[PDB]
Nucleic acid binder design. Structure first.
Length: 225
RNA sequence: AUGGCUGUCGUCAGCUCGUGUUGUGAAAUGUUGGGUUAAGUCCCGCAACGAGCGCAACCCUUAUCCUUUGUUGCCAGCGGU
């Protein structure tokens, strides 16, 4: 149920950014620098990866709801195959400022989505002209482009999973406000203090983000069972 | 001292609210930015997300055809003048 260090070496989890963009709040997780490129200290990560999954074992056991957040085009596709396979919720596109704290408004937009979603099945657009139908599908697709992965959310999620916290610092501000356990994949240039469960790793690699997703996929399915 | 009614900026495209967020606060954000339009009209980005009054549309007239009717209106196809 846990990953080995050998597989992570092939995954490229320790290939951080340069020594010019590094964040000084990551010193306890910085190994060295080769060709002026910081290496993630893998010794601290592996044990912290398990307790991160251990926390995932507890929340998923009590019918908990988790949220995978990643707005990078080099990670936007993996999260789609992740949440849909493990029966969860995700946000691959633009993280709206106010998805959590301003839920009383995003709740109605979901009703607006489901209003146009229900209108798309029966075919109500066939009696309206081409102008009214195209207009109702240009927003319906935009809400699918925004709230498409959280249509059946049902209230505030109980856990937050983030990919590269510094690129998602809007989501962490909302997570620390409501008191939600946030599990983030922090990079050498990212923000560690905002997240209580930090997982020092890389974000600009395809195989790196999937190795995390493969691990979190099984542990949450262990909670559903 | 007022109601109702009116002129003008101006038919200019702006004016605001609920929630969230930012700053001790007045307030800001939304309404900024790249393009675009007659126009905060529309798309994309974006700590903003939505909505309301406005703009637009629905109203009237004019322009083309068809259907319905033919008076006191009209006169082509046929006669008497």
């Amino acid at each position: 149920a846990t990953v080995s260090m050998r597989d992570m070496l092939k995954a490229g989890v320790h290939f951080g950014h340069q020594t010019r963009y590094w964040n000084p709040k990551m010193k306890p997780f910085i190994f060295g620098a080769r060709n002026k490129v910081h290496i993630i200290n893998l010794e601290k990560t592996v044990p912290m990866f398990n307790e991160a999954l251990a926390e995932l074992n507890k929340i998923a056991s009590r019918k908990g709801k988790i949220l995978f957040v990643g707005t990078k085009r080099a990670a936007s596709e993996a999260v789609k195959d992740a949440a849909l396979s493990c029966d969860q919720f995700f946000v691959n596109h633009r993280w709206l400022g106010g998805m959590l704290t301003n839920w009383k408004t995003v709740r109605q937009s979901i009703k607006r989505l489901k209003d146009l979603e229900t209108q798309s099945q029966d075919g109500t657009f066939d009696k309206l002209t081409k102008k009214e139908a195209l207009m109702r599908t240009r927003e319906l697709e935009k809400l699918e482009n925004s709230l498409g992965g959280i249509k059946d959310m049902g209230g505030l999620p109980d856990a937050l999973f983030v990919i590269d916290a510094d690129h998602e610092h809007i989501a962490i501000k909302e997570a620390n406000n409501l008191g939600i356990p946030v599990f983030a994949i922090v990079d050498t240039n990212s923000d560690p203090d905002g997240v209580d469960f930090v997982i020092p790793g890389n974000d600009d690699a395809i195989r790196a983000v999937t190795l995390y997703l493969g691990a979190v996929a099984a542990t949450v399915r262990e909670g559903r069972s």
